[PDB]
Amino acid sequence: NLDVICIGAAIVDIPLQPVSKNIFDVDSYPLERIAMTTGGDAINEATIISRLGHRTALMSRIGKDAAGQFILDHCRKENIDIQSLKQDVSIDTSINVGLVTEDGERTFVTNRNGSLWKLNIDDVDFARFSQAKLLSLASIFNSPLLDGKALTEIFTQAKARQMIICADMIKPRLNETLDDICEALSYVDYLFPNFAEAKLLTGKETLDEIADCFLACGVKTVVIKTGKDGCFIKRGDMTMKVPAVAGITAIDTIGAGDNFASGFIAALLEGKNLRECARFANATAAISVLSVGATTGVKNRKLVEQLLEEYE
Amino acid sequence: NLDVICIGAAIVDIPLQPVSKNIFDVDSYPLERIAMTTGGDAINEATIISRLGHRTALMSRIGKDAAGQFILDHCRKENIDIQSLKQDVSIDTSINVGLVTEDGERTFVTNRNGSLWKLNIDDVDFARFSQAKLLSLASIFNSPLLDGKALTEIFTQAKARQMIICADMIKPRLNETLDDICEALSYVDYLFPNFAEAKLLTGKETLDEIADCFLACGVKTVVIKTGKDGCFIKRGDMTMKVPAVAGITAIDTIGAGDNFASGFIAALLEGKNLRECARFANATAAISVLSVGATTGVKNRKLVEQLLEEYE
Ligand SMILES: Nc1ncnc2c1ncn2[C@@H]1O[C@H](COP(=O)(O)OP(=O)(O)O)[C@@H](O)[C@H]1O
Ligand SMILES: Nc1ncnc2c1ncn2[C@@H]1O[C@H](COP(=O)(O)OP(=O)(O)O)[C@@H](O)[C@H]1O
Ligand code: NA
Ligand code: NA
After folding, report:
1. How far apart are CA A211 and CA B61, in angstroms?
2. Topology of the domain covering B1-312
3. 10 Å Cβ neighbour count for B120?
4. Contact B300/B49 with Cβ under 8 angstroms?
5. Contact assessment for residue A17 and residue A53, using Cβ atoms and an 8 Å cutoff
6. Closest-CA distance of chain B to residue A157, Å
7. What 3-state class would DSSP assign to B129?
8. Name one GO cellular component term (chains A, B).
9. Distance between CA atoms of A270 and A103, rounded to whole angstroms?
10. Do A70 and B66 touch (CB under 8 A)?
């Protein structure tokens, strides 16, 4: 009954909005509310995929603390399988405090030593791999210790067991290059790069050229997210552009990529053709940019399906 | 077995240091650590009084959330009785985010709707008052709903059971004046105002003057904390100054007042005379200003007693 296993760091965000740009001008900021929220690509994806109707399991490692507890409770409420989401007293669950000014300005205070940086291949339980159909690596480069060699092993274990392999990416944190992951990429079935970051990573400027760098490493299908323009897909010699949902005015696109990937994976598991998977992903992502927060918009599934009847 | 009942708001803190004065512009601050800490006058006192060898119970109300559970974990660990520390599903446990600059500056982002603001007389269980000897109101004015009328009621209940009533203070949050709590003050045996804040509240400049406004309301003993100068004590005409522990460098005075009151209360329960109660309070407070954090310095009684020999 398990369709997806998502691997990545589960973390907690604490948004502080809105604060003055000259924060120390005053002594205190009595906000309307201060509360934790689950964040991180892995959490967002497992959460959205689950709401879309596909049973998911999250593999990660958090601390034995209040933030870790909040994550587990979130997963229990979303019906995310948490058997492989272990707690460790030796670490602190990463907590990202995001400050925002009553004008738009943003900044983030993070824990350079949080659980996000501690995640490694040891937190991956291969025995469970035969229980799901698809593996989603919620962000290559996100957790540095999960480098090329680790991913190659993770993906190698996934491929025995015949799983479909999906992966998103973020900008490298430790100067890594495409070189560092080219071998790991040869095992990937669907890669979901972000245009700007993919451009910076490959050093190429056009969608075709950027996509070719990944395909040359062995990736089967490349799905580049182009924000307002939807997405660009390339497999073998075939390319296809799929326009974003029309008319939408984005509040904020935080987590838009995660929602996109989730919608795509859902369509994939349901056997839709490549264009249909792209439209479902664009529709899911579109709904999420209309609300503040990564997982606010996509509350269920009906919402996405309704937007689909109105894609134009 | 139960020696003290402390009443106040139990909260959690997330200290962020060090951040830029010009916090925005950057996008990131990878700190060495971001972790929760229990905080609040009531929690700090219950904690230190417990480490000093006296059993304490904390009366409060927090949210039935992750933060709340964290406070309950801290209490159990410190052997603080949490029978009267209720969890409420409808409220969010207050979380204070503290920002500190590399060179001094401090600001706090708070939750104007937090549990701290919700505390009221209904959260006080008068039935247990017969189980303890001393009542400690961890800060008049801290929780607005506990105004002069409520305190009068609480203190009347405490006095009918012959408890010793101690009270600490903070600066009024909603423009309350000394007249708003003068009737309540007539039930207090020991009041611990901070010098600067007492000056603002009473409108006086002299310790003798300040102490006098409180004595006028019926307070038995006034113990004004004067930082590096130790403390000033005054009773019906009788006045006394007690020098602080000399030679104390002083790293930070966060929670120094809570430590002072805890040491004073411990000495009172041990039957010490007024002067040595002050010495013990000054000694406990001294140890706390040497370490960063409110309850970091005073880990055990022996640490204070050692410092006590050579108080000079
Ligand atoms: N303004 C928008 N209108 C419609 N869909 C959008 C919009 N912005 C983002 N999306 C959806 O989110 C997906 C991911 O967006 P992303 O590439 O990260 O955009 P950005 O760089 O603007 O943050 C897109 O492929 C699209 O489906
Ligand atoms: N520099 C110091 N040296 C010795 N004891 C100190 C010092 N600073 C504070 N204390 C202790 O803490 C108690 C309360 O401190 P308080 O007056 O509130 O300090 P502050 O004004 O720095 O907040 C004092 O009465 C004293 O016992
Ligand atoms: Na995005
Ligand atoms: Na103090």
Report:
1. 56
2. UDP-N-acetylmuramoyl-L-alanine:D-glutamate ligase (3.40.1190)
3. 14
4. no
5. no
6. 34
7. helix
8. cytosol
9. 42
10. yes
